[PDB]
DNA sequence: TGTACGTACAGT
DNA sequence: TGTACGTACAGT
């Protein structure tokens, strides 16, 4: 079905809000967060038990909203080390969709300063 | 004469190498370094008296020499903290040059992946 | 600024 | 990994 577009950095904020245990190597899932009165682009991360860690750090939501509201692509994400962190953590993000998708994704990270690697 | 293109950073490295001294707020030449055998996009970085302090990352020269050899830009270099240390320092860097080589500048950038800030 | 924090681990 | 190093200074 889907296939992969690549792959990207970026963190997690906000750690020192939420409780959820997050483990090295260990997947998070993204979930918008829409009705966020401080960024309507609001990006959630949540552990593998959907207990939530931060969020997407604001740039990144800025750049990644456009692309899940308008189902571009499905973002996979990945804590590569830093588990035990005080206030942000490291994010290996990968992107999959339809072939057909893949250079409206790259536009739209180019258009926010970020690439797939 | 030559017009601004704008702002980008990157990194002095090899510090450990020479003797240059560098103080903070204090500007730096680059200098590409077209015979050097470990790269030969290699660019140095010396002080305002022309005392070597290191090289740009590779990376970023792997973006710059282009523009240098091509006379595209003159490349402005400021580093804004960190001028005593170990191995590395930060670099601001402003690109100047005739209005019609910004694209092509913006371009050789963007197919490294660094951006005009 | 100094320091508490994050993370690379030290040219070209 | 732990730690010596670089630098941000701590959601959305």
Same sequence: chains 1, 2.
């Avoid at 692309?67 to 590569?80: C, F, H, R, S, Y």
Wanted: proline share 3%.
């Amino acid at each position: 079905g889907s296939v992969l577009f690549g792959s990207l950095r970026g963190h997690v904020v906000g750690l020192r809000y939420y409780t959820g245990v997050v483990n090295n190597n260990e997947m998070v899932a993204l979930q918008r967060d829409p009705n966020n009165p401080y960024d309507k682009n609001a990006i959630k991360v949540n552990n593998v038990n959907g207990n939530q860690v931060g969020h997407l750090k604001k740039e990144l939501a800025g750049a990644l909203a456009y692309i899940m509201d308008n189902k571009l692509a499905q973002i996979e994400g990945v804590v590569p080390f830093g588990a035990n962190n005080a206030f942000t953590m490291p994010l290996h993000m990968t992107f999959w969709g339809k072939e057909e998708n893949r250079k409206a994704v790259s536009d739209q990270l180019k258009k926010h300063g970020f690439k797939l690697g």
